[PDB]
Amino acid sequence: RNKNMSTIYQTSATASAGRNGVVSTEDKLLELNLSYPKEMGGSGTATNPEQLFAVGYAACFSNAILHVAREAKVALKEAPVTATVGIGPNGQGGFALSVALAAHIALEDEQARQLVTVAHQVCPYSNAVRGNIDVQVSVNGLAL
């Protein structure tokens, strides 16, 4: 489930001032300023690793749903996904993420459900956090 058996795509990024400086892909396709959010005492003038994870997870899960749709020959124009990410202490000295994913799919409900369930199985963010984060997944307003 967890082994990447043959790398199809590889990328890299470098940061040096943690949550409060610049971060960029080594190809420079993506170059971003980061700052602490207001909730953490910062300026909120820029993004942060929690928002990045939300953006990337929403995008990965949306890609995943469209992937499965293509494979099932289901014509889906869009697969909007809202990802909500929280961060707090884990009580052992570190920090942990909590995640909710809300998918909105123009299909009959049982069908949408099946599709999104398979997508959650195949999505590499989902495989990455499986058993660590209990990702709360819903499809068209209903929890899976």
Of 98, 97, 67, 99, nearest to 83 by C-alpha is 99
Residue 39 assigned to a binding site: yes
138 lines the binding site for its own copies (CB under 8 A): no
Sign of CA dihedral 139, 144, 56, 122: negative
7 lines the binding site for its own copies (CB under 8 A): yes
135 lines the binding site for ligand X8Z (CB under 6 A): no
**Interacting stretch for its own copies, rule CB under 8 A, among 91-99, 106-114, 136-144?**
91-99
Residue 78 assigned to a binding site: yes
49 lines the binding site for ligand X8Z (CB under 6 A): yes
Q: Which is nearer to ligand X8Z, 46 or 112 (CB)?
A: 46
Q: What would the two tokens of residue 116 be?
A: 């999104």
124 lines the binding site for its own copies (CB under 8 A): yes
